[PDB]
Design a protein around this ligand. Structure first.
Ligand SMILES: [K+]
Ligand SMILES: [K+]
Ligand SMILES: [K+]
Ligand SMILES: [K+]
Ligand SMILES: [K+]
Ligand SMILES: [K+]
Ligand SMILES: [Mg+2]
Ligand SMILES: [Mg+2]
Ligand SMILES: [Mg+2]
Ligand SMILES: [Mg+2]
Lengths: 238, 51, 142, 62, 208, 126
RNA sequence: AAUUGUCGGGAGGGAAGCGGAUGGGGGCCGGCGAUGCGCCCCGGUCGGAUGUGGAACGGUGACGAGCCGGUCCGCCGAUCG
RNA sequence: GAUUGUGGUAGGCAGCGCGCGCCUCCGGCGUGCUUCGGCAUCUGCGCGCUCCGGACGCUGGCCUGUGGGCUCCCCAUUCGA
RNA sequence: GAUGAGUAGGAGGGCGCGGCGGUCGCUGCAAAACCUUGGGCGCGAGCCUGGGCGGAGCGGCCGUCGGUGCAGAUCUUGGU
């Protein structure tokens, strides 16, 4: 019939080459995905075992200290969760600047913060505007699972797949949600990168309300360090 | 010299489902959750039977 | 188009005697094109009957279900009187569709508008049929 | 409310297309838009950006 | 062919056994040993070539949008535990509102097949939506009632005069139902009387 | 003609944005004007006052400018301008211009019936 | 247009007017709201090859050759649409 | 219990069943590691299923009607002003 | 993907009026103007249209121009 013009032939040939290379890439991706699934399964198993072992070790250490007649001082918290409880109206310069540096720009936003003398002293200046404590494993896991959003190219992307986490944190070995949870809870060597990767959590208003946000938690208010009791507030806020 | 043409970049955003409610999403994010749930259920059943 | 069609489009996309615009230049703006060699009467470079060397013309001939299929000759752009290769088809719709396909896509004339040419042929054929026997159904059922 | 400057929007203005009505310049801009998109060449990106600039920002060379 | 499920479900979507135990139970090891240490490769099923559809008579000017695939398939309607064969139901809507009727079975469509019996309260064999019914604690034996031949198609309209065949079938069905009802004292009067709310009667406190 | 539109038409507001105090002074027309007064309660958006239009009221782009019948309007002044809609009869309807004579209106109506083009005012001047 | 008379509807315990939500009454609207589609049987009209000739012509090529091709008209078969 | 379905060329992603072995079929039979419970250790293909890349399905009423709709008009009422 | 307050003030994109160079049209089978609890479009400036009246002209689009947009000024003239 009609002879095929050379331009159409060239286009078809190049399209065939592109299809072949795409198919090869897809096959390689599928194989590596299978390997990654096995790896993340094993890693999650190991992390769960580690958490259980740490809890048991803490209980045993306390019991042994009591038996010996002495005292065991628990290791100080290495991680904090900070929730803004005041609005953005009528802000003093230093407080506003510190709250931006903590990435708390909206009321009821939440962020993790590694415990440090510099960070602790920064938080001391804004104590009236926030409440914070020591998050639970359940708290961290639920926050990351339900409201965890990653920052890719300065955009907010929901963590619906492990590929989103991988694209940003594969250089550091974090390629799955469980890896991210472990890095956050343990404050691993790459805690900074993983934490910055997490978009500030946008929490809802507390389910049961607040007591009084104009007073410190010690006086019966809500501001300040409420230590292990931050977890119930997180339950009501997530 | 042009790079291969792309036709699958404009994918609609995947709807976010909470892994804490539906099982398939949780398994997709964390396959070990299946084993964890299975072991927890079996242990609870064994304890109830023993009681 | 004695000059490349892209330049002609750059010139005429702003204004031309075949351009029909209504309802201002806001969100309400509606644009159409009147030139007979525009299959969809759309003001776009793809369908433009002024900025393309190869164009398809499909319109109803005067009488007897005769549909005019014409294509601009590629080497006669400077000769308006002999620019169109006119073919008048008087046969059934199937033969007309086959001829339109052969003259539009099978020869690689303008494959990108094969669907537009077929739809235009169908619309013209339906219009001729209705014009002969009049309206017999409302065509409102989905 | 959210503590952002101008709601997080940019306040810098840069040229995104030529202000000229020269059709040939527009065709060149289309050419180099395609080149930039489908090659990712730094040279092509620089050429495209400079094609937008004003007269005083395209000084002559002796 | 295996006659029993290999992996019973603890809950929806979770099996009782793991991948290792499933490997052992499924016999993949046996298949590999029989085939010579390698699994048997099965060729992909050949697709059926599309039929030579005739050319269209018309060509639309617009490309109609094809809807995206919906992977959810509806499941059969659930029947409340309080409703079991022979249970007495109270109709809360329609021309038979308040009537007390006997439940026979649930049809394929999910509607409930009930009878008055027709003689007792004038309610014939009928379909009632479960959402417009209250299931009480009164149960009557219906083992002797045969309604196998009656299904959702029995009530389908053919589009004024009731055929005699339906009357005969209703009489045949209701004979055994009335025979069973007569066993329980005062059940005839109960089924012949409608349910109503009197003064200081609270629906949320009645047990039914 | 079966309209191509499928999404339902949703109006964020069906009431007109009437100029403040146009009910009070006859000389003040209804056509919207944004108050610029320093003390204007309408400009300050005091609750219970006249509402001011804003871009937030914008109609969905998919259903914007669509008539209730599901088509978009195009004004036609003669039968020749009618053929422009031959390939767009599922999205566009024709409205005959108010100044067209009845004689030409009959020809336009006949041609549109031939072309299966909806006319919004085909009974005018009949 | 301000303003006024008449007729008809309506409201009125020291203003009227106005924003939002329904309702009563009135007024208006038939693109206000469809009746088509597919598969078969009967009857009526119009045309029917990859064959053979004629008229004009096109795609590509190099507004050459070669190759390929559609429209229309007349014939032998085909007996379909 | 309540609000809601935005999109419209994908059978993808994740998890899992049936056949490719047998027996006496609420189950049992092979190789390794086990905390002796168990284990992503063997986990491949074909056909299928699901909480799995954003709603689908059935029925009824009505279609010139005292029907349906209304951004139009006059009023009444709750809140605002 | 993120985000949305705005006087003084700045800017962008649009709406509207009257001419000029072009182009496409309408009109005694009824133009402009005016009237109307007729209808519709636009967030809006506004726009399209039914009906009436009127009885001779008028509009759309692309450029371009201007004595080009009123609620106020104890504003002007006229009318009430
Ligand atoms: K006024
Ligand atoms: K504004
Ligand atoms: K629901
Ligand atoms: K003009
Ligand atoms: K009007
Ligand atoms: K002008
Ligand atoms: Mg937020
Ligand atoms: Mg204070
Ligand atoms: Mg007056
Ligand atoms: Mg002047």
């Amino acid at each position: 019939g009609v002879l095929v013009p050379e331009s159409v032939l060239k286009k078809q040939k190049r399209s065939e080459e592109w299809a072949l290379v795409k198919k090869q890439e897809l096959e390689a991706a599928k194989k590596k995905n299978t390997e990654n699934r096995k790896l993340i399964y094993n890693r999650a198993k190991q992390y769960a075992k580690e958490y259980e072992a740490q809890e048991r070790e803490l209980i045993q250490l306390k019991r042994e200290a009591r038996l010996k007649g002495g005292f065991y001082v628990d290791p100080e918290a290495k991680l904090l969760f900070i929730i803004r409880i005041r609005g953005i109206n009528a802000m003093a310069p230093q407080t506003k600047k510190i709250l931006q540096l903590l990435r708390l720009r909206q009321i009821f936003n939440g962020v993790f913060l590694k415990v440090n003398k510099a960070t602790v002293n920064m938080l001391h200046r804004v104590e009236p505007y926030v409440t914070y404590g020591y998050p639970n494993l359940k708290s961290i896991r639920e926050l990351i699972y339900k409201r965890g959003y990653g920052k890719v190219e300065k955009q907010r992307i929901a963590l619906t797949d492990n590929s989103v986490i991988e694209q940003v944190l594969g250089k550091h070995g974090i390629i799955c949600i469980e890896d991210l949870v472990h890095e956050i809870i343990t404050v691993g060597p790459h805690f900074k990168e993983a934490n910055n990767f997490l978009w500030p959590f946008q929490l809802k208003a507390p389910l049961g309300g607040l007591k009084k946000k104009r007073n410190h938690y010690v006086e019966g208010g809500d501001a300040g360090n409420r230590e292990n009791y931050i977890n119930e507030l997180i339950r009501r806020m997530n | 010299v042009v790079r291969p043409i792309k036709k699958d970049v404009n994918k609609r955003a995947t709807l976010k489902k909470n892994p804490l409610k539906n099982l398939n999403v949780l398994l997709k994010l964390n396959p070990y959750a299946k084993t964890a749930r299975r072991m927890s259920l079996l242990a609870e059943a064994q304890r109830v039977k023993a009681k | 188009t004695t000059v490349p069609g892209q330049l002609v489009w750059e010139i005429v996309k702003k204004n031309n005697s075949f351009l029909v615009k209504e309802f201002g230049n806001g969100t309400a703006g509606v644009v159409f094109s009147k030139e007979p060699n525009n299959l969809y009467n759309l003001h776009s470079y793809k369908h433009s009957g002024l900025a393309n060397k190869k164009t398809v013309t499909i319109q109803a001939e005067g009488k007897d279900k005769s549909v005019l299929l014409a294509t601009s000759k590629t080497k006669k752009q400077n000769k308006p009187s002999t620019l169109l290769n006119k073919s008048v088809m008087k046969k059934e719709f199937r033969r007309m569709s086959k001829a339109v396909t052969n003259q539009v896509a099978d020869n690689y004339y303008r494959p990108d508008l094969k669907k537009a040419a077929l739809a235009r042929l169908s619309a013209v054929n339906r219009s001729l049929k209705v014009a002969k026997s009049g309206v017999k159904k409302k065509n409102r059922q989905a | 409310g959210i503590d952002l400057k101008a709601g997080g929007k940019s306040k810098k203005t840069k040229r995104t297309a030529p202000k000229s009505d020269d059709v040939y310049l527009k065709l060149l801009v289309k050419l180099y838009r395609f080149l930039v998109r489908r090659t990712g060449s730094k040279f092509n990106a620089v050429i495209l950006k400079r094609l937008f600039m004003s007269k005083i920002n395209k000084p002559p060379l002796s | 062919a295996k006659k029993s499920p290999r992996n019973p479900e603890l809950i929806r979507g979770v099996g009782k056994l793991s991948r290792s135990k499933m490997y052992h139970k499924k016999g993949l090891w046996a298949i590999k040993k029989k085939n010579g240490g390698s699994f048997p490769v099965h060729k992909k099923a050949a697709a059926v070539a599309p039929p030579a559809v005739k050319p269209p008579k018309f060509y639309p000017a617009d490309d109609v949008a094809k809807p995206l695939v919906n992977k959810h398939k509806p499941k059969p309607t659930k029947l409340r535990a309080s409703i079991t064969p022979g249970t007495v139901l109270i109709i809360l809507a329609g021309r038979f509102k308040g009537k007390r009727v006997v439940f026979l079975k649930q049809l394929k469509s999910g509607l409930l097949l009930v009878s008055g019996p027709f003689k007792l309260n004038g309610v014939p064999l009928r379909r009632v939506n479960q959402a417009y019914v209250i299931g009480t604690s009164t149960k009557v034996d219906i083992s002797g009632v045969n309604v196998e031949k009656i299904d959702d198609k029995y009530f389908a309209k053919q589009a004024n005069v009731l055929p005699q065949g339906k009357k005969d079938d209703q009489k045949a069905v209701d004979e055994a139902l009335i025979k069973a009802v007569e066993c329980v004292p005062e059940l005839k009067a109960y089924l012949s009387a409608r349910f109503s709310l009197k003064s200081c009667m609270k629906p949320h406190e009645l047990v039914f | 003609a079966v309209p191509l539109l499928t999404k339902k038409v949703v109006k964020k507001r069906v009431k007109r944005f009437i100029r403040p105090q146009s009910d009070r002074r006859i000389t003040v027309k209804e056509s919207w004007r944004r108050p610029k007064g320093i003390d204007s309660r309408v400009r300050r958006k005091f609750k219970g006052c006249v509402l001011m239009p804003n871009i937030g009221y914008g109609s969905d782009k998919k259903t914007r400018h669509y008539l209730p019948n599901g088509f978009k309007k195009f004004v036609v002044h003669n039968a020749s301008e009618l053929e422009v809609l031959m390939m767009h009869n599922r999205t566009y309807c024709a409205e005959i211009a108010h100044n067209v004579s009845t004689r030409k209106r009959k020809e336009i109506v006949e041609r549109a019936a031939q072309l299966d083009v909806v006319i919004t005012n085909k009974l005018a001047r009949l």
